[PDB]
Design a protein around this nucleic acid. Sequence first.
RNA 1: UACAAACCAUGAAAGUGUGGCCUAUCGAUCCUUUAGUCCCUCGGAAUUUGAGGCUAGAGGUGCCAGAAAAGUUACCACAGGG
RNA 2: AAGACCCUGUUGAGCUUGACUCUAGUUUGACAUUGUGAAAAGACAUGGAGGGUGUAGAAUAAGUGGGAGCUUCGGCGCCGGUGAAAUACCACUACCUCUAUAGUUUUUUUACUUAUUCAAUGAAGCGGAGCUGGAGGUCAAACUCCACGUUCUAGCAUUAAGCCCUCUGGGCGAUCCGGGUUGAAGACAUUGUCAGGUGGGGAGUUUGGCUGGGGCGGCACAUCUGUUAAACGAUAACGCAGGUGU
RNA 3: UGAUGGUCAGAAAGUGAUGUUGACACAAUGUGAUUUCUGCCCAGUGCUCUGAAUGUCAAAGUGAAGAAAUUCAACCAAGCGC
RNA 4: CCAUCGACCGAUCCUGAUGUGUUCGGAUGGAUUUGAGUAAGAGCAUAGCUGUUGGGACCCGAAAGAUGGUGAACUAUGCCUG
RNA 5: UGACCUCAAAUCAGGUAGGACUACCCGCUGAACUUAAGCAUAUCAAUAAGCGGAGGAAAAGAAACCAACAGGGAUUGCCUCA
Lengths: 217, 67
Amino acid sequence: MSKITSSGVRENVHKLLEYSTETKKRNFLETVELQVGLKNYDPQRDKRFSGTLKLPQVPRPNMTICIFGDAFDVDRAKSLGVDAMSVDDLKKLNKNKKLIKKLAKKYNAFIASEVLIKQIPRLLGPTLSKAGKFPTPVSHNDDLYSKVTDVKSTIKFQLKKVLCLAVAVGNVDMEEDVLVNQIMMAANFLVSLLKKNWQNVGSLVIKSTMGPSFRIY
Amino acid sequence: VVDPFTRKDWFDIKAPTTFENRNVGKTLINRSTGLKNAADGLKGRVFEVCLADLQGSEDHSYRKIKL
RNA sequence: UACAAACCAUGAAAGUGUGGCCUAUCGAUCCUUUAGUCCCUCGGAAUUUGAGGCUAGAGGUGCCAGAAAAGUUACCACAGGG
RNA sequence: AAGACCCUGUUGAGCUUGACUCUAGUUUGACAUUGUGAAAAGACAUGGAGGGUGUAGAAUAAGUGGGAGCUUCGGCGCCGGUGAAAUACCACUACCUCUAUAGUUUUUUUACUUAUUCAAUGAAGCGGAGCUGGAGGUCAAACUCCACGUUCUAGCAUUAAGCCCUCUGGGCGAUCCGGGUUGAAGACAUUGUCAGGUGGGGAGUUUGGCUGGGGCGGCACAUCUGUUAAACGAUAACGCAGGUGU
RNA sequence: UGAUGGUCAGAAAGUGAUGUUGACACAAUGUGAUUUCUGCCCAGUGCUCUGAAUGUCAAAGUGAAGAAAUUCAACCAAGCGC
RNA sequence: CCAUCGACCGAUCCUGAUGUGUUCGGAUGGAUUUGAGUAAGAGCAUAGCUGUUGGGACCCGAAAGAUGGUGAACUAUGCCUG
RNA sequence: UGACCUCAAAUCAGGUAGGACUACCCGCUGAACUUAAGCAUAUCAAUAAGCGGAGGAAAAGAAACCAACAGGGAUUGCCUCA
Ligand SMILES: [Mg+2]
Ligand SMILES: [Mg+2]
Ligand SMILES: [Mg+2]
Ligand SMILES: [Mg+2]
Ligand SMILES: [Mg+2]
Ligand SMILES: [Mg+2]
Ligand SMILES: [Mg+2]
Ligand SMILES: [Mg+2]
Ligand SMILES: [Mg+2]
Ligand SMILES: [Mg+2]
Ligand SMILES: [Mg+2]
Ligand SMILES: [Mg+2]
Ligand SMILES: [Mg+2]
Ligand SMILES: [Mg+2]
Ligand SMILES: [Mg+2]
Ligand SMILES: [Mg+2]
Ligand SMILES: [Mg+2]
Ligand SMILES: [Mg+2]
Ligand SMILES: [Mg+2]
Ligand SMILES: [Mg+2]
Ligand SMILES: [Mg+2]
Ligand SMILES: [Mg+2]
Ligand SMILES: [Mg+2]
Ligand SMILES: [Mg+2]
Ligand SMILES: [Mg+2]
Ligand SMILES: [Mg+2]
Ligand SMILES: [Mg+2]
Ligand SMILES: [Mg+2]
Ligand SMILES: [Mg+2]
Ligand SMILES: [Mg+2]
Ligand SMILES: [Mg+2]
Ligand SMILES: [Mg+2]
Ligand SMILES: [Mg+2]
Ligand SMILES: [Mg+2]
Ligand SMILES: [Mg+2]
Ligand SMILES: [Mg+2]
Ligand SMILES: [Mg+2]
Ligand SMILES: [Mg+2]
Ligand SMILES: [Mg+2]
Ligand SMILES: [Mg+2]
Ligand SMILES: [Mg+2]
Ligand SMILES: [Mg+2]
Ligand SMILES: [Mg+2]
Ligand SMILES: [Mg+2]
Ligand SMILES: [Mg+2]
Ligand SMILES: [Mg+2]
Ligand SMILES: [Mg+2]
Ligand SMILES: [Mg+2]
Ligand SMILES: [Mg+2]
Ligand SMILES: [Mg+2]
Ligand SMILES: [Mg+2]
Ligand SMILES: [Mg+2]
Ligand SMILES: [Mg+2]
Ligand SMILES: [Mg+2]
Ligand SMILES: [Mg+2]
Ligand SMILES: [Mg+2]
Ligand SMILES: [Mg+2]
Ligand SMILES: [Mg+2]
Ligand SMILES: [Mg+2]
Ligand SMILES: [Mg+2]
Ligand SMILES: [Mg+2]
Ligand SMILES: [Mg+2]
Ligand SMILES: [Mg+2]
Ligand SMILES: [Mg+2]
Ligand SMILES: [Mg+2]
Ligand SMILES: [Mg+2]
Ligand SMILES: [Mg+2]
Ligand SMILES: [Mg+2]
Ligand SMILES: [Mg+2]
Ligand SMILES: [Mg+2]
Ligand SMILES: [Mg+2]
Ligand SMILES: [Mg+2]
Ligand SMILES: [Mg+2]
Ligand SMILES: [Mg+2]
Ligand SMILES: [Mg+2]
Ligand SMILES: [Mg+2]
Ligand SMILES: [Mg+2]
Ligand SMILES: [Mg+2]
Ligand SMILES: [Mg+2]
């Protein structure tokens, strides 16, 4: 049966708010990193899975971005929008392993525009992109600041070759119950991506950049 | 098929002090395993060695001792 | 056996062909199995398995309108029969 | 004297047997009765801690979500260079291993006794230890073993004599301790329930028809050709010459 | 057939016969005083004996697939076979 | 009321409109098929004779089977005492 | 030297059970004749015979019920369902 314990996660985000308001800390809020255990599965043998829905509140409160290109780009992220770029290395580079490797290891997300359909599998390809890059679906007549502020809310959940996958998001600014079930609105993918769905769960841990584990599932 | 001699352990035979050349020779037995020790299945063995060997002198060539 | 409605073969065609030139050459109920319709039901409501129905074959009864079946009695019994 | 021989009856019985269908018993397996240890081959689980590449980073990754001297210090330092992935990291998760805690766990062996099972006695002397001798040869210091009142005789042996303390009574005589009556057997037998085998010892039933009696034979029992068949059609016999299950 | 036994009894039993018994005994058969002898055959049917490897092999148990009912497979006692 | 050809209802087969939870719906027109039907109700009830089936079944009749009891005053065999 | 627990004895003090009847009643156990034109599952029949136990009635009885409705509402019996 589904191991959903919303009341259990209420007292657990408080215990997270303990070591993020009470107990001891630097002073303030940080990265929520509650974990699981994950058993009853198989890293090899079967196939793959993925699932992206934009989470209720803002996860990454200081999201890192690097907008690619200049064509239909930048001109939509000037003034009120920061970041952007100035191509420059889109004509040079392409022979340096770095700079593109530096761009990936520095910033946390790029974009996809309507001209990046070239650069993602051409100027990079086996050099980058497929190594773990997820271009952002952004164009002209779109939501603009709303759909890229939801990029902070755009979580992943892909499969690799390890029985861990206990990632999390959010921050401690949230009210007493703004999380708890916001995290439960992220477990839907992790449910429907495994083979036996709600069965392939081995443990569950409440924790952040701060806690250990406060007796959960 | 198995070459049963890979599992043999060699032991040295020592004669009593009544004789001179107390190093009689060597024997072997199946190596000691968990079920059967080599020691218990090895005691009770009888060795027939010439008395001339136990004393060096050939005057004892016509007597043979069971140890 | 002769047609009706199909779908075909053959032949230039008319035609012929619904097994063997004709008169023999074979098989119910219950059960099982296969095919068909992919249709109805499982009765508080559904999904999927499973089961049950409807139509046509097969598995067989030769004692062939179709029980499941070894002897002995000079130890013998009964109902009868000219 | 409602033939006892013969035949018929979809009537029996006694008896037999690898006829059909069963069955008491017995045998074999599984589960329960059923508990306590040790060891072997081993698997697990839990507590620890610790471990790692082929290059490049001189620096041993084995994983994936992040900032900043925290531990006095500042040994090494915290994204910027070198890698596919980064040198205090940390917050914890996840794997995996090859070391240890003495955790439960299959197959084989042998130890236990309290379940169960066998036997005896008027539940009489059990188990262990200790007194005494006989020995080992003593080489420290008395460790080990044995015995610890009866054997020429067809008699007798019963209800303590004797000693110690004084307490018409207590102790020794008659060594102490454990209240397990004493052996065998033992978680195997036995017993309960299913499962396979065996089971005329026993039970129940059956064991065609036609037919110049019945039986044996044959099939005239489902059938086909010609004739008998007497010029439509029909027509019998264990009539004639023949055929079919392909 | 050496007692944890053979043969037999009972629906069962902390139940019975042999048994106040122990191979010079009990139980089961065949032949049938004495004399002289009892030949060949173990292929059949029985009875009996070993099981080191081994065809068949129930329930339980094991493994796998499935969501399950279930299905398949390996192992597999005695017996049979050898 | 008789013979015959039709019509309607149900089952079976064929065709398959506007439409639509796009797989449902089934208009319309047909078919050597089929029903114990419609086609201006005829039944229900009581009684009687005759006929049927189950019952003792027109009356009397087995050899058998089962259940529960009574006998070793005869006789068979063992024991005990004469 | 006194409690407690368990187990005993008394012609202790006082009580209670047994046995009977058969028509009906509550259980256990349990056939076969017969029918199937034979016969084994079936049938007779959850009956006869056997055993235990009550009463004026016994038993059952106030839902772990029936339903699938617009819902009924302990048990029992009759008519019907059939
Ligand atoms: Mg034609
Ligand atoms: Mg339904
Ligand atoms: Mg048929
Ligand atoms: Mg047929
Ligand atoms: Mg016939
Ligand atoms: Mg017959
Ligand atoms: Mg005779
Ligand atoms: Mg005769
Ligand atoms: Mg006559
Ligand atoms: Mg007569
Ligand atoms: Mg007569
Ligand atoms: Mg006769
Ligand atoms: Mg007849
Ligand atoms: Mg008979
Ligand atoms: Mg007979
Ligand atoms: Mg008779
Ligand atoms: Mg056992
Ligand atoms: Mg005794
Ligand atoms: Mg013992
Ligand atoms: Mg046992
Ligand atoms: Mg048993
Ligand atoms: Mg049997
Ligand atoms: Mg049996
Ligand atoms: Mg028999
Ligand atoms: Mg018989
Ligand atoms: Mg006849
Ligand atoms: Mg005949
Ligand atoms: Mg004949
Ligand atoms: Mg004949
Ligand atoms: Mg006939
Ligand atoms: Mg004629
Ligand atoms: Mg004629
Ligand atoms: Mg005996
Ligand atoms: Mg008993
Ligand atoms: Mg004897
Ligand atoms: Mg003989
Ligand atoms: Mg004799
Ligand atoms: Mg003679
Ligand atoms: Mg003779
Ligand atoms: Mg002879
Ligand atoms: Mg010869
Ligand atoms: Mg022979
Ligand atoms: Mg023989
Ligand atoms: Mg099996
Ligand atoms: Mg099985
Ligand atoms: Mg299984
Ligand atoms: Mg095996
Ligand atoms: Mg075997
Ligand atoms: Mg055998
Ligand atoms: Mg349309
Ligand atoms: Mg349309
Ligand atoms: Mg249409
Ligand atoms: Mg319509
Ligand atoms: Mg009609
Ligand atoms: Mg009418
Ligand atoms: Mg009569
Ligand atoms: Mg009548
Ligand atoms: Mg009548
Ligand atoms: Mg009569
Ligand atoms: Mg009878
Ligand atoms: Mg008498
Ligand atoms: Mg008599
Ligand atoms: Mg007498
Ligand atoms: Mg009194
Ligand atoms: Mg009474
Ligand atoms: Mg009965
Ligand atoms: Mg009668
Ligand atoms: Mg009959
Ligand atoms: Mg009759
Ligand atoms: Mg009869
Ligand atoms: Mg019955
Ligand atoms: Mg009665
Ligand atoms: Mg009574
Ligand atoms: Mg009364
Ligand atoms: Mg009254
Ligand atoms: Mg109530
Ligand atoms: Mg009611
Ligand atoms: Mg009522
Ligand atoms: Mg009616």
